Design a protein around this ligand. Sequence first.
Ligand SMILES: CCCCCCCC/C=C\CCCCCCCC(=O)OCC(COC(=O)CCCCCCC/C=C\CCCCCCCC)OC(=O)CCCCCCC/C=C\CCCCCCCC
Ligand SMILES: CCCCCCCC/C=C\CCCCCCCC(=O)OCC(COC(=O)CCCCCCC/C=C\CCCCCCCC)OC(=O)CCCCCCC/C=C\CCCCCCCC
Ligand SMILES: CCCCCCCC/C=C/CCCCCCCC(=O)O
Ligand SMILES: CCCCCCCC/C=C/CCCCCCCC(=O)O
Lengths: 359, 359
Amino acid sequence: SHAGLFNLCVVVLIAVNSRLIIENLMKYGWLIRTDFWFSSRSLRDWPLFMCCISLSIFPLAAFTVEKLVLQKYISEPVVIFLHIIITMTEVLYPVYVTLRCDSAFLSGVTLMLLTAIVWLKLVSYAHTSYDIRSLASYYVSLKSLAYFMVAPTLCYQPSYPRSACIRKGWVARQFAKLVIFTGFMGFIIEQYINPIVAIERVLKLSVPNLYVWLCMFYCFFHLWLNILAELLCFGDREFYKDWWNAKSVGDYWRMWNMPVHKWMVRHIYFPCLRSKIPKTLAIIIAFLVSAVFHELCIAVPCRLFKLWAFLGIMFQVPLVFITNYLQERFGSTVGNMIFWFIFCIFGQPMCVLLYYHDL
Amino acid sequence: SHAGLFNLCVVVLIAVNSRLIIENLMKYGWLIRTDFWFSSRSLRDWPLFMCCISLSIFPLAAFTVEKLVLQKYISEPVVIFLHIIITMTEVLYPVYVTLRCDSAFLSGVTLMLLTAIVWLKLVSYAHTSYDIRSLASYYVSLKSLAYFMVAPTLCYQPSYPRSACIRKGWVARQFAKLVIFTGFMGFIIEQYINPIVAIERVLKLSVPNLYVWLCMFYCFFHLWLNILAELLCFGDREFYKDWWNAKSVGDYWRMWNMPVHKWMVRHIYFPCLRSKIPKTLAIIIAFLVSAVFHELCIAVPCRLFKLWAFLGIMFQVPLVFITNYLQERFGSTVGNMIFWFIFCIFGQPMCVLLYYHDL
Ligand SMILES: CCCCCCCC/C=C\CCCCCCCC(=O)OCC(COC(=O)CCCCCCC/C=C\CCCCCCCC)OC(=O)CCCCCCC/C=C\CCCCCCCC
Ligand SMILES: CCCCCCCC/C=C\CCCCCCCC(=O)OCC(COC(=O)CCCCCCC/C=C\CCCCCCCC)OC(=O)CCCCCCC/C=C\CCCCCCCC
Ligand SMILES: CCCCCCCC/C=C/CCCCCCCC(=O)O
Ligand SMILES: CCCCCCCC/C=C/CCCCCCCC(=O)O
């Protein structure tokens, strides 16, 4: 119902880390870790911002081809090829910029995350436009496309949802939490995650890392997406179901992200059901279009020659079936326990630590 | 909705304590800590069991006086005095037995907890009988009284609730969790709680202790009370609301225990409202009849000459008002945070550690 358990965890982290949290150079800088930890003005991030602004051209090209389809000369497969090559360049060019230019913990990662979101939205816009035009005013269309692009959803036509209320003027009650919460992660990386500045100990290494993920889940999904929905007055405000109450790893993927789940359902599962392709390949396709966006986020900025996250995400397809069998045999409690163990030992948070140890 | 966060905490405790949990003398004894940790047959617990069986006489005396009130010779205030002295002896005699006889972590504590429950039930039976008789078959009355005494509620007349279904035959799916869960606490006391086998560190001492309480809240309220209700086919099965989602310490007392909350509401708040006594004294009375039952549980078996838990519980009356003002000023999130901090530093779990450090 509320975040009481999260408040308990935050209070526990504050209490156990009493020597450093309470005693720190707070006379001039109230930040827990450093005055400028995640990034600073010294970094040459201006090309990254310039390319982020320039990334808006691909939506403009999608708009112009979608407007140009009304002409009789242009046909369907040429438009499909144009959409495919526009989407391919939209993912290729940021990768080239990130490889050639420098990167950081947040400076280079944000370029890749926006690229995946725009790619998913660009595919979503094209597929929805094709579906709408299949059945037998520039300003309104451009406004709708811009609202879809800025809104916190991966599905076109967000008009049906409507907030129907004035946005909260006192948003600083929420936003002020975020800058505080991102401080705590800045502490947690400093103390717990520091390998080099009996049979195995990776589980002992997985205890703090999963706490970084959930906090990273709280900063983005709970706070930032709700702020985006409220500022834009978007109707729906349910970006994730109770993913922690997942009987298996298969159910976690449906609950942890509702925009991504809905995109996968409407674009990868729905046409496969319409095309008579059983949901045995759709799972691989869904996980293929998730790993490519969970590997470009983490491998592209830093070095990449081993322990690729693509294989880690692709390994989930055995794991969802294995956990489904295990929970169906041993009950919901055992299913939740083995799901948490799998998420700790071979889950998403472990991929970040595998790359941190590499660099 | 489920215990996914609790499963996450259990998996985290297993992962961080990988050296001892995985590697242990499990060839002959599968218990985590010791073959006989909490108690053993060597302890002379037979007098304690004999007195626990003998404790059932006070309900029989309550029954016999309640049956004898129908006679014209006996009056009301003599019956009230008989109920008062019977309740007083019912709490005095177990205290005398525990002081004279030996005690342990669980051997002596269980004698005191049953005494408080029977005292609350005996007062509840007498007050309800007086209310029923105020307005103008031995076997059925005895059966109803026995069902009330064994049932997991502190209020008389549990007949209106009804399970109306057959109890779960495969109860071992639940009971087998409990003996496992009590094992984990047996580990947690061993490693974390071991003081003697900068400005302050009590917060660092409060981090594990609150985890012992919540697990102790899971073993008793979630599992044992539900098992008692299902075996006896008792209707209501809501022994606690979302106490973790408490904006203040005042709301925690209402949510953490529904039988005790209902007893306090029906016996201490309701007649005070009927008697025109404002709810400013009822809170002190409610906490006076809670501290006496949170001090006899912990001080009576072990030594008691300082740091009495009665003063600790009585100190809550300032704290509920202070936390109400603080949360009303600073919002629900700040209220939950300061509630968790107060519960860590001066809450119920700290009282147990204060006595553990003493002995
Ligand atoms: C040039 C400056 C731009 C800078 C950003 C300004 C944003 C406003 C944006 C765009 C205008 C550009 C116009 C161009 C195209 C417009 C199309 C577009 O992308 O806009 C819509 C989009 C915007 O919001 C974002 O998510 C964008 C990403 C921003 C956040 C990254 C920020 C810094 C790094 C880490 C943050 C630390 C983490 C705490 C968050 C605290 C901070 C928040 O939202 C959605 O619709 C998506 C629907 C939601 C589902 C998407 C799949 C979710 C999957 C996975 C992650 C799972 C783990 C969570 C955390 C992941 C990160 C570790
Ligand atoms: C001779 C052998 C008897 C031995 C026990 C057999 C029980 C069956 C009983 C009785 C027949 C006797 C006939 C004589 C009179 C009958 C009247 C009577 O008392 O029966 C009803 C009663 C029974 O259940 C109990 O609670 C009794 C206590 C038993 C548990 C203690 C056990 C060992 C120590 C610790 C356990 C470790 C903790 C994990 C639990 C794992 C184990 C479970 O239940 C209720 O109705 C109460 C309504 C619920 C509200 C009461 C207020 C709650 C407040 C606070 C505690 C808050 C913290 C929780 C944990 C507290 C402990 C740390
Ligand atoms: C130096 C920078 C190091 C960065 C390492 C940590 C990066 C954290 C990444 C977060 C998880 C990535 C999730 C991406 C989801 C994309 C959308 C999709 O799922 O399809
Ligand atoms: C050696 C034994 C040491 C025991 C120390 C720990 C005891 C734990 C006690 C649990 C909390 C007590 C709660 C009692 C509630 C009684 C009913 C009421 O609230 O009115």
